[PDB]
Amino acid sequence: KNRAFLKWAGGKYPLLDDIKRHLPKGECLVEPFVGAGSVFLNTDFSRYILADINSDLISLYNIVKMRTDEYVQAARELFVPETNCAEVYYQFREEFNKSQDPFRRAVLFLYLNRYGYNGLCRYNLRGEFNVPFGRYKKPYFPEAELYHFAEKAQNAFFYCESYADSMARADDSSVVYCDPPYAPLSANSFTLEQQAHLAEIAEGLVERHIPVLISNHDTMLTREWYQRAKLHVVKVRRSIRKKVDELLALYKPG
DNA sequence: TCTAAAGATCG
DNA sequence: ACGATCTTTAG
């Protein structure tokens, strides 16, 4: 069991056993919504193609892969007792938003992920990061996790683009896993129109003998979008009050 | 998930 | 120059 080095929304570490039970075998794995990378880090394919719409995240992954020793030594200097203070936090956030150097922006990005409020990621319409101070007791510097990420990445390529464009890179030796933002539980972001279009693209790939696996909440809407697949219920019963389970859908060819 | 200030849109 | 009703911002 291997851990990511970033805090992130909708991370899949606790569901890995159920995912690996139903995921097919092949030469190359494609992830159109990669995020913090928990599945990439806990599987064994010989090639990977990894993509996301967030451009600060993709640039950080390129620096860590190609300039490893230089990156670690510089980032370690920001994790000391002197920097756990509100007046210092708001000046570093300001330096980040004004800089135009990829290496310096990547160093500061990790500090903000581990000292900021509840570990969030949020921006305004101008592209400035605006999460406030978090006040933790003693944050942890993920050194071991950073070296292991660099090592596995020697066999992957990274891209900044949307889900229709990355899914079109697949060929007759590939396998695809999708993890989109969650569907709503009651009546800008990922739209209803977009949730349905994703299911349509999957039905077209499976005609070409290319297999696909998807995950989301178990509701009335998701059962309708994914009607042409085989469905498996995962009991979780998380409160809020009511219980909700999770769902997996598998498209397999003949 | 929350809320007091500031800016956007139409007749 | 006016006012009712929405969006947007950031602790």
Ligand SMILES: Nc1ncnc2c1ncn2[C@@H]1O[C@H](C[C@@H](N)CC[C@H](N)C(=O)O)[C@@H](O)[C@H]1O
């Ligand atoms: N149109 C889009 N195309 C591609 N990625 C998107 C799009 N919209 C949102 N995303 C990303 O989808 C990701 C959703 C995450 N929940 C995935 C978590 C990931 N499985 C992990 O283990 O960390 C986010 O990182 C988004 O930035």
